[PDB]
């Protein structure tokens, strides 16, 4: 997270850390959606241009974390992966369209003051909240800048959703309906954006009617980090809720 600030304890109880068993390494961010499922981006688990293509055994899921490095005994829970589900229409070849993947835990996780699931969005939630101008929150342990560095604590940043026109002609990359971009405009003043290490993390919004948080998106891609005239792109969660319910109800 660039231009972010330290997260308060329990500010993002659904924040998940995707960890590489060997060699030890922080791969991506993710979200706890139930005591059994974790949502994350597809390029985190599979992306051959970097020859990234993990299998359960390779990864571990660390929940309830605050500190980036330290193993927080009795607070964070570590879970093994039963199965990895990557969207069949996921397209990395061109622009990472339909960038999403679910992960079932071998054993259900117990919730706590530090471990709580976020809500997925429904039609009412999307139509209502995914509006340009409306702000969302992004969290992560990713780098603090394009180059250098790394945070010692989970980083948080709030970002405004940008109209599709501005996004589309803000890049030479093809922007699909499964994507949405967010960030501050060059002149607005304020800054911020996710960055390496934040991918797969959540972009949540808080409903004004029920006080509940909904994950509207997943950090997908961006050209650099916190560049002007540029924006971060997020997987449009709802637009793909069909696939989610599919694999959750079926598996």
């Amino acid at each position: 997270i660039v231009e972010g600030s330290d997260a308060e304890i329990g500010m993002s109880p659904w924040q998940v850390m995707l960890f590489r068993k060997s060699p030890q390494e922080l791969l991506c961010g993710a979200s706890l959606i139930s005591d059994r499922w974790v949502l994350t981006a597809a390029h985190c688990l599979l992306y051959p241009p970097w020859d990234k293509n993990f299998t359960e055994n390779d990864l571990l899921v660390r929940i309830g974390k605050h500190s980036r490095t330290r193993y927080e005994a009795n607070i964070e829970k570590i879970s093994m992966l039963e199965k990895i589900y990557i969207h069949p229409r996921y397209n990395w070849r061109e622009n990472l369209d339909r960038d999403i993947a679910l992960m079932k835990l071998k054993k259900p996780v117990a919730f706590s003051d530090y471990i709580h699931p976020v809500c997925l969005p429904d039609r009412e939630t999307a139509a209502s909240l995914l509006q340009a101008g409306y702000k969302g929150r992004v969290t992560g342990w990713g780098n603090l800048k394009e180059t250098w560095g790394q945070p010692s604590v989970l980083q948080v940043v709030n970002l405004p959703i940008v109209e599709r026109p501005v996004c589309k002609d803000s890049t030479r990359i093809r922007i699909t309906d499964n994507m949405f971009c967010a960030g501050y405009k060059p002149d607005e003043g304020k800054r911020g954006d996710a960055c390496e290490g934040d991918s797969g993390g959540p972009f949540v919004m808080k409903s004004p009617f029920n006080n509940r948080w909904y994950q509207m998106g997943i950090v997908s891609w961006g050209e650099g980090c916190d560049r002007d005239g540029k924006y971060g792109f997020y997987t449009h969660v709802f637009r793909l809720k069909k696939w989610i319910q599919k694999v959750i109800d079926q598996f």
Partner: peptide, 27 residues
């Protein structure tokens, strides 16, 4: 079911440092 409600925040009627910025972006 009980999703999106933070034990240390909503559950205790306490707001975090910046959630208010979010609620205001709706105006």
């Amino acid at each position: 079911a009980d999703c999106g409600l933070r034990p240390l925040f909503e559950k205790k009627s306490l707001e975090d440092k910046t959630e208010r910025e979010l609620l205001e972006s709706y105006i």
